[PDB]
Amino acid sequence: LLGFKIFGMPLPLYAFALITLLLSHFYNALPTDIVGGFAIMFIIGAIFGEIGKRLPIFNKYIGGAPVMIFLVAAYFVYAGIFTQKEIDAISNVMDKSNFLNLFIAVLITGAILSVNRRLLLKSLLGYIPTILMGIVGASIFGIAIGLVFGIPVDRIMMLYVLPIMGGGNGAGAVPLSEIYHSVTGRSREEYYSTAIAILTIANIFAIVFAAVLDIIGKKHTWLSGEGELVRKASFKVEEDEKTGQITHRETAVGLVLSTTCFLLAYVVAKKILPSIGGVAIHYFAWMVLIVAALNASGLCSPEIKAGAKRLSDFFSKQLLWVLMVGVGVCYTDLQEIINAITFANVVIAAIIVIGAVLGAAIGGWLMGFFPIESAITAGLCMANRGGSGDLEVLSACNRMNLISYAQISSRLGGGIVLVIASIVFGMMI
Amino acid sequence: LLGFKIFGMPLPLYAFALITLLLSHFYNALPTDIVGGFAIMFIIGAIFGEIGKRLPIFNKYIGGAPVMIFLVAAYFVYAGIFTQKEIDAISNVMDKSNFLNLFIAVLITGAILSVNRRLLLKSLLGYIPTILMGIVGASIFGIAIGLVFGIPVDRIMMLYVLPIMGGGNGAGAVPLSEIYHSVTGRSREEYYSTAIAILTIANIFAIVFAAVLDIIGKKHTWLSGEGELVRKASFKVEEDEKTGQITHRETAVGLVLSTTCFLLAYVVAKKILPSIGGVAIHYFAWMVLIVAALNASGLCSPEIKAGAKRLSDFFSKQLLWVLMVGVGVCYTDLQEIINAITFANVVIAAIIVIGAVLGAAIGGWLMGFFPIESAITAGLCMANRGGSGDLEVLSACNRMNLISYAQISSRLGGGIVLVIASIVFGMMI
Ligand SMILES: CCCCCCCCCCCCCCCC(=O)O
Numbered sequence: 131l132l133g134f135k136i137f138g139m140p141l142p143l144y145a146f147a148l149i150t151l152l153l154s155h156f157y158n159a160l161p162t163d164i165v166g167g168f169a170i171m172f173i174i175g176a177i178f179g180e181i182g183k184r185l186p187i188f189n190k191y192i193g194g195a196p197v198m199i200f201l202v203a204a205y206f207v208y209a210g211i212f213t214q215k216e217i218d219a220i221s222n223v224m225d226k227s228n229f230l231n232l233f234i235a236v237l238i239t240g241a242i243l244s245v246n247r248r249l250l251l252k253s254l255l256g257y258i259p260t261i262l263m264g265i266v267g268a269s270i271f272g273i274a275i276g277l278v279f280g281i282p283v284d285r286i287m288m289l290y291v292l293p294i295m296g297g298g299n300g301a302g303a304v305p306l307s308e309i310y311h312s313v314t315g316r317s318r319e320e321y322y323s324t325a326i327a328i329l330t331i332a333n334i335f336a337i338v339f340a341a342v343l344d345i346i347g348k349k350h351t352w353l354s355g356e357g358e359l360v361r362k363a364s365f366k367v368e369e370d371e372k373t374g375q376i377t378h379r380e381t382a383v384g385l386v387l388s389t390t391c392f393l394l395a396y397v398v399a400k401k402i403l404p405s406i407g408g409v410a411i412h413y414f415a416w417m418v419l420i421v422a423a424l425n426a427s428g429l430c431s432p433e434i435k436a437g438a439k440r441l442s443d444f445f446s447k448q449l450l451w452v453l454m455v456g457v458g459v460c461y462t463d464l465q466e467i468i469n470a471i472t473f474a475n476v477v478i479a480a481i482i483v484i485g486a487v488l489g490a491a492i493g494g495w496l497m498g499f500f501p502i503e504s505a506i507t508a509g510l511c512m513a514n515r516g517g518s519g520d521l522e523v524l525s526a527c528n529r530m531n532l533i534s535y536a537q538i539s540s541r542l543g544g545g546i547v548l549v550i551a552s553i554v555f556g557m558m559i
Numbered sequence: 560l561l562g563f564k565i566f567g568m569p570l571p572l573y574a575f576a577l578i579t580l581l582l583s584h585f586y587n588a589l590p591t592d593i594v595g596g597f598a599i600m601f602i603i604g605a606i607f608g609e610i611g612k613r614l615p616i617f618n619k620y621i622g623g624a625p626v627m628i629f630l631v632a633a634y635f636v637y638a639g640i641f642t643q644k645e646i647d648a649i650s651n652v653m654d655k656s657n658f659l660n661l662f663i664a665v666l667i668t669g670a671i672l673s674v675n676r677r678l679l680l681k682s683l684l685g686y687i688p689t690i691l692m693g694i695v696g697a698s699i700f701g702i703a704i705g706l707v708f709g710i711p712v713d714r715i716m717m718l719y720v721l722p723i724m725g726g727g728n729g730a731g732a733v734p735l736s737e738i739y740h741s742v743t744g745r746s747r748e749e750y751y752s753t754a755i756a757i758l759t760i761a762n763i764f765a766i767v768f769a770a771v772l773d774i775i776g777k778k779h780t781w782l783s784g785e786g787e788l789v790r791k792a793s794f795k796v797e798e799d800e801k802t803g804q805i806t807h808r809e810t811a812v813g814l815v816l817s818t819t820c821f822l823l824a825y826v827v828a829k830k831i832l833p834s835i836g837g838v839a840i841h842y843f844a845w846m847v848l849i850v851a852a853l854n855a856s857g858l859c860s861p862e863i864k865a866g867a868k869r870l871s872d873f874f875s876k877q878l879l880w881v882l883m884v885g886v887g888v889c890y891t892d893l894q895e896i897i898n899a900i901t902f903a904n905v906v907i908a909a910i911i912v913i914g915a916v917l918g919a920a921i922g923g924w925l926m927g928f929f930p931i932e933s934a935i936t937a938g939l940c941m942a943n944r945g946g947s948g949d950l951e952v953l954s955a956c957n958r959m960n961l962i963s964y965a966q967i968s969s970r971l972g973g974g975i976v977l978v979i980a981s982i983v984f985g986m987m988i
Pocket residue numbers: 229378381441444593805806807808810869873
């Protein structure tokens with residue numbers, strides 16, 4: 131029994147950590163800074179992510195560690211289990227320090243700089259139209275089902291299709307809320323709450339639908355290329371330039387590039403070029419474009435690109451549970467989440483996910499890719515939160531080697547959905 | 560010359576980063592959070608640390624990249640070059656988020672957990688008395704030189720001996736200021752300015768005397784030791800446990816252990832056991848004791864200890880320049896620092912460092928260690944700034960394999976000096 135590992139820690143060591151956390155909670159002593167925040171969040175995320183990953187049905191279909199972690203943390207906040215000091219520490223970690231934007235910037239730059247430049251240019255000609263086709267199909271089916279259920283098309287486009295089809299909470303929920311407030315000038319709280327609820331429902335349906343799509347792909351040998359996206363000789367003409375040995379300095383350079391690209395995007399979106407026309411472009415979209423331009427330019431060495439990828443891997447696979455504890459504490463309210471679990475809303479989300487899958491599959495077939503793997507890669511992983519949950523959709527499916535495609539889908543889809551969301555916000559209100 | 564590397568980045572890449580920083584500064588747009596803080600501080604630390612390393616005489620003797628960096632950052636703050644937004648972002652990173660405490664916690668846990676358990680338990684029987692002998696010799700020499708210069712014994716002990724023989728800025732300067740305020744009930748800042756100035760002067764003199772000690776060791780062979788500390792058959796019989804494979808999960812476990820140990824120390828020092836006797840113990844000394852006890856207990860696996868060491872290496876070798884930029888911006892004030900350089904202070908610091916060297920050498924010879932190696936490891940690398948002066952001294956000498964001894968000396972001696980400072984503060988007032 132003692133050989134069981136919790137977050138890579140032997141059971142006695144995690145017992146020591148939990149004793150420390152309980153002592154701090156009961157003595158009401160905690161440094162309201164990043165150290166106290168990490169001390170609480172690492173332990174809580176470890177235990178609850180392990181529980182969520184072990185529980186069978188939750189792990190298989192619901193979403194597992196991140197969903198369980200943030201739901202339980204938000205329930206802890208609601209029930210008053212958390213002390214005001216711990217709540218303040220977590221809110222200082224992810225509000226004053228903005229560790230959320232740090233994490234999102236690291237993930238964006240890792241996902242974009244990871245790919246080889248020639249492969250990126252080869253993809254962007256045919257892969258991007260598949261993303262656009264998935265978006266338009268999801269929008270069409272969302273409008274149809276909204277008309278069926280009587281929800282107005284304006285409300286559908288504002289609340290249902292865009293938050294679902296865009297990125298996760300860190301990118302694609304709070305940026306859309308900010309753009310909504312900046313353009314339409316209504317309160318952010320209710321928009322954010324409903325968007326988060328329907329986004330979580332869409333994540334649930336995305337995992338389940340990827341599972342059933344893997345089943346149907348097993349059933350039908352044709353229209354499914356196991357573990358391969360392209361249908362043209364599986365990209366027979368493919369060469370890798372080179373990659374060397376990666377040291378700690380390369381990872382640090384990746385972090386520096388993360389932060390510098392985010393700063394440049396912030397400056398450009400805030401003061402340099404706030405608006406191309408009547409549309410306002412968000413600094414996350416500018417960051418995606420800037421990192422893509424940096425990758426295409428060739429300034430980055432292969433070692434630097436590998437270091438950025440490895441830093442992104444470290445963040446995504448270690449600090450994700452910490453991020454989820456903080457998200458559960460700061461950006462979730464159980465009462466309104468539950469009040470947004472109506473049968474109408476859940477069926478709307480299911481139909482939108484069907485639309486995204488169908489559009490992505492038909493676009494991939496039209497542009498030369500395998501339709502099922504296209505449907506998981508784009509459409510799915512875009513309806514899914516992205517980052518956390520892109521791994522879950524790939525894990526539910528038998529296909530995991532497409533993780534680079536999944537991350538690039540999440541990031542570029544985020545940029546595009548923010549651009550289109552700004553356009554539609556201006557067009558309607 | 561475009562292949563020349565600045566902080567591991569080629570010249571065009573750093574040109575892009577510096578263009579980003581200049582655009583941010585001139586447009587006065589910057590996110591006042593950890594992302595903006597790192598965006599400023601990586602760039603500034605990189606350029607100015609490279610300048611400091613390339614500067615020949617400064618690099619070799621006066622100080623390294625850390626010294627050059629925080630001096631330049633302090634000058635930038637003094638001359639008004641830094642924008643108010645940039646100052647706010649850096650102070651948010653260093654004070655509101657309290658990145659300094661996280662850095663110190665990671666350093667302490669790496670330096671103590673990284674040591675093999677059996678080797679640590681065998682070494683402490685003869686290495687701690689060397690540290691104590693060095694401290695007592697430094698105190699005696701400081702008292703003598705203060706009597707020569709007319710400085711009172713209590714003033715000498717409070718302002719020159721303890722701040723020099725303690726750790727660096729993070730541990731041994733601000734903890735000493737806090738203890739001074741809590742015990743004697745006097746102003747923190749007036750103590751801290753003189754403490755940091757004397758600490759910097761002592762660091763310079765310690766590096767110079769380390770070079771002199773290397774020369775004298777080359778001269779006389781029977782004191783040298785040729786880079787080996789122990790003088791008992793050169794470790795004829797020794798066994799080490801295999802470490803296995805190191806992963807990102809072990810690195811994250813090291814981070815968890817660092818943060819949890821810091822939290823436990825904070826709780827113990829604030830609520831559980833604020834005072835073991837009449838003396839009050841600081842939470843940094845408590846953390847040193849807790850991490851030593853955790854190492855002795857054997858709960859941590861060798862993989863986990865290697866991961867803690869790897870985090871210590873990553874932080875110490877990459878985020879040190881960022882931390883130095885933050886220290887220069889926030890905790891450094893050139894006006895009173897320069898006012899604190901004088902003939903009397905310089906002579907007192909030099910005599911204190913010489914006394915520490917003599918005491919450590921005598922203790923090492925009595926306990927069996929090589930005299931020159933013992934005087935470098937304890938006394939030196941303890942009078943320094945705990946995190947950077949040890950690297951600078953070991954680089955000034957030809958010995959670098961004693962980095963583990965230097966690290967454990969810095970951290971454990973910092974804890975011991977904190978306890979001793981509390982005792983003497985209570986004694987005098
Ligand atoms: C807000 C605080 C940010 C702290 C960022 C810490 C980043 C640590 C990066 C470590 C990963 C790279 C080195 C791994 C080494 C190994 O796995 O052996």
